[model samples]
Structure formats: structure tokens, C-alpha cells
Target chain A: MVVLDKKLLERLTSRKVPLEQLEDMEKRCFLSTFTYQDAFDLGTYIRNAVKENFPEKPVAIDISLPNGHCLFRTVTYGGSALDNDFWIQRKKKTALRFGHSSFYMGCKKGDKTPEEKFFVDSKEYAFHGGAVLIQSERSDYPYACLTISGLKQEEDHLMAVSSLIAFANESL
Target chain B: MVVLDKKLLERLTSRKTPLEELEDMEKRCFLSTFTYQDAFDLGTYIRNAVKENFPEKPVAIDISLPNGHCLFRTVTYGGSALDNDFWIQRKKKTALRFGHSSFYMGCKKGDKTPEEKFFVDSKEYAFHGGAVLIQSERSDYPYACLTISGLKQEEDHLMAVSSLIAFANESL
Candidate 1:
């Protein structure tokens, strides 16, 4: 079975994000505090967004604390494949390691593969567009990762931004 | 040169423990004001204990906090096999999923294999033994998992219990 069409893969790999724009987004999503409740609330919002926006899509939403404790994670009906689960880990691993968004990393990578960009051959990391850091406003420290998978890489990253946007709006 | 001998496997599959006992442990370790320092200290202690107790053995010790972050993980000088690394995650997954000792679950399973007992592929979990919940004294929840691998299934479980026992004895 084809995991992803060539067009989608090429489209995902060709993103061009300005450093300042991604940096600005990092600051934009910071919350006052992060806890299991926050993860649940935000994860719920993201899940519902999928059902409302892409009703037919099988998606996985994961919100995890920086320590890697699973706070909230769920799969939609019809569910995703085993690949989705691994994708979540890879995306989360990427964001956490770079202290930024995986989408940001993919942009910085400049068409270089994960191996070429960072000599990392481990299956644990994926340099892709999905998985954004969940951070607290104070100390500029990241607290968790909001990882979305089972959608196209770009769509996955967009959900992360939209969910955080909604979450920040809710907190205010 | 065998990992789990026939007698050891039989003994492991035949054991049993009460649910009450396991719950007591689950609550004991689940909630903790557990800190990174605590993890490191206990990790160092466990590593030292392994060295003194089994100088020639190739064992892997992993102390991980609740979110699945590694607090401390070190193998014997030469390290065990790559399978030891795999076993640690499997055992940890087992503890996290069942919310109790892997050994307890294995004992209750009686002669059933992981596939038979849980109908779960061994790829995601190990039903054998060697990992125990690490919880705080005050909280009725687990804070971390203490896993020992590269030893016999029974021995692995024993080391986990012994390290916690040591921590309990000295901490108070």
C-alpha cells in the first residue's frame, strides 16, 4: 500500500518558513501553565476540530507533558494505522529535541533529509511538519508537545496551530 | 548462555499475587512530588547495586518518570544486548498499562503467553516480568517505573523490588 503519494511527500518537503515567523509562533502559543487538564481540554478541541472540519478523516491527537507522560491521546473511528502511532512519536521527538516545531525543523532542513540535516539515522526522530511544542509563558520553557498525525503532514501541522490558537483564545 | 532457563520460565509463569497488594504498590508509586534529582539518585543507587551484586552479569537498569522520560538508564560496562534495550520498553509498557508489577500480571496469567493472556503482540508489551511501579509515599499514584532487564525474568523482578526496598529503608 502506498503510505503517501509522491505529490504529497514532495509538497510537504518543500515548505519554506521564515525563521522569524516560526519563532513568532513559538511565543504566540505559550500558556500560563500546563497540566493534564490543559492537555485534555486542548486535545478535546483538536479532536472536535477534526470531526467538524474533516469528518471522514481518521486522526490521532496526542498531548503529552515534556517529561513524556501521556496526558491525552485518542484515535478517531475507522482509526489510523500503526504508522500513525510511530509518526506521533517521531514528530514529538523532533519537536522536543529541537525545542521548536517539527514543521520549523523541516523548514530549516532545506530539503536535506533527516539524515543529511542532522546525521540522525534513528527511527525515533522524524523531521516533518506536525508536532509543536506546548510551552508556558513564563521562563520561555516548553511544557508539552501537541502532536497530530493520520493526516497529511501539512494538515497535521495546521491542526496543531489551530488547536493552540483556539486553546490560547479559550484561556483568555 | 541462555537468557531465561526452563525452570526459571516455569517458576515465572506459575507465580501469583493478590490484587490488593498490587494496588497498594500502584498508589504508593503513582503520585509523587517526584523530582529529577530523586530519579538520578535512585538510578545511581540501582546501578551501584547491580555492580556489587552481579559483577559479571550484563544487566540494564532503567528508571523512568511517569511521562516515559528516562530519568536514568545505564547498562553494565559492556552493556547487554540490543534486546535488553527493547525489553526495558516492553516491561515498562506492561507496568504502565496494567498499573502494577509485570511479575504480578505474569503470575496471574499462569501458563498463557503475552499473546494468549492479553491477546497483545509482544511488540508493544512484555508480560514476563522485571519492572515495578515507583511511587511516592504520600500519593496513591505511580511517579515512575523502575525496570531491570538482561537478567532472568524472576531475577529482573527481584532487583526492581530490592531497589525500591532499599530506597524505602533509607529514605525514611
Candidate 2:
């Protein structure tokens, strides 16, 4: 089956992200290089770093297998605690299915796009920021995903990306 | 909604398993008492024990969040081995939805039961062993599950329960 086509890959990567930011995102998010042990270690790093930096904020950090089960999660206070788990599954599904960050897939000119519409109406998928592919190959299809919830969608995306970069730096 | 009704719980715990065997199972499956840290420790213990004792078997051990993502896994062999990830999700779905071992849920004196029929017809779930609930409360609905694949269904259940017992023993 055609898992991802060229046009979609181009659209996914053609976000208006700053060149320097894109460079950093490329350097980090090295999920393709990860063994399960490495994924676990990276997840641990992200959890600790988030706790240290955002001590008062309610948040959840999740790392998941390709089928969408959470491998690791750090959830602080939240109204509906299970929402984080549900969102993690949905957002990760969005990223993996569309081969892009949930944010990128959902946003067009700062408004919800057709791609976002496709899933926002569904019971099973979430089309928002805070979930992104752990793309490793030059092909850029994701090997796995990292996701965050319990914050604003954009902030959630930032948290996942920033912590991923932090984990990469610490490993190096 | 009532998560687990009383009759179902009674039926699930009424296995022909001996009192001593139940005691052993209880001693080993401390999943009901697990904090996230304890679950991680158990997963680690199961992975290591499998490698040490069953060196020749090409087995996969998985500890998963109840929502379907793998929490931890040890895969020492097999190509496209992560197919275990998919199977774990399917089998766990059967176990949880029925509140019984996947084996028990699917079996009916070697005849197909409605439970097996329900999932076998659907493409998403599996009616096989290697998946059992991490039942904590006396009510016995699973909070999570541990699964093994790459062995006979009965052997798969044995590996998970036995390794869980090993982990529990070490923890105490």
C-alpha cells in the first residue's frame, strides 16, 4: 500500500517554520535511530525535564508505539485525567496518518484546514498540535511519535519538540 | 457507567485454578498494587528474566497501558518483530473487553463461542492468549495488561504470569 505519497510529504514539510527552527527540529527528533531502550531513555529525559521546568503547570508527556499505546506518560493535575491518554492516542494518530506534526496538518493560515476537518469530526482522532512524528529516514515517514497534552495545542507542540531536542542534546 | 459488573467479576475469578495456584498468581501479579514506577520495574524484571531463562526462544514480552500502547517490551529476535506490537493490542482488546484471559474468552470446548465470533469477524481484535489483565482490585477488571507472543497461547500466558511472579518476588 502507498503509506505516504510525495505531494503529501512536501506539504507536510512546507510549514512556515523558521529556517533555524526547522534545522533544530531536523537535528533532534532522531526517532529512526532509536532502539526501544533509546526510546525509553528519551521518554524518561522528557518527563524529568518537563517536571523540572514547568513544575506548576498541569501537563502530560507521552511516548507511544506505532499502534498508539502509551509507552510512557507523566501526568500532573488535570480535570479529566484520562483525556490526556485519549488525546495522546488521537494526536499521535493524526501525525502518523498524515505524516506530519498534528499542528502542521491542522493549521492553514492560522485557521483549521481540510486535513484538520477530516479528523476533528471523528470520534477516534484528534487534529491539534502537541503531537509529531519521530521521523528518522530521509523519507521522513515517522517511526513513532511523541505527544503532550494538558496545555494549549501550540504550547503542547512546543513542549514535545523542545523536550525531544533536549533529550537529543543530553544523549550527545 | 459500571466498569465491571459483579456477575462478570465472579465468573472471571471462578477459574478451575487451584487455591495454591491462585496464591502464586496473586503473589506474582501485583499489577493491582502497581504505581507507574512499580509497573516499570516489573516490566524490566520480566524482560531480563526472559532473556536469562529462555535464551533460545525468540520471544517478545510486552507491558502495556490499558489504552493499547506498549509500555515496555523485550524483542530479542524475529524480523518485522514489532508485529508483536499489533498483536498485543489486538489480544489485549479481547481480554479487556471480555474481562477474561484472551484464551478463556475465545475458547468453548474447542468450539467457537460468540466472543471469538465477535472479534474474528472484525479485523481489529484478536481472540488468542498471551494477553491477561493486570487485575488489581478484587473486582478484577484490568487496569493494564502484560502480554507475550511468539509462543503457544498457553505458554504465552505462562510466560507472562511466571515472569510477573519473578518480578514480584524480586520486588519483595
Q: Which stretches of candidate 1 lie over 4 Å from their true place?
A: A1-40, A46-93, A96-99, A119-128, A134-144, A148-172, B1-16, B30-38, B50-59, B64-71, B75-90, B96-99, B120-125, B133-144, B150-155, B158-172
lDDT of 2: 0.60
Interface RMSD of each: 7.4, 16.0
Q: Per-residue lDDT tens digits of candidate 2, residues B43-162?
A: 677666656655666777777655455567677554426677777777777765654666565553245554455635434677666776664433222446788777666566656766
lDDT of 1 at B79: 55
Model 2, A27-78: lDDT tens digits are 4665335555766787777666656655677777777655454556677544
lDDT of 1 by residue, B57-101 (tens): 998999875457676899975858889989999988888777578
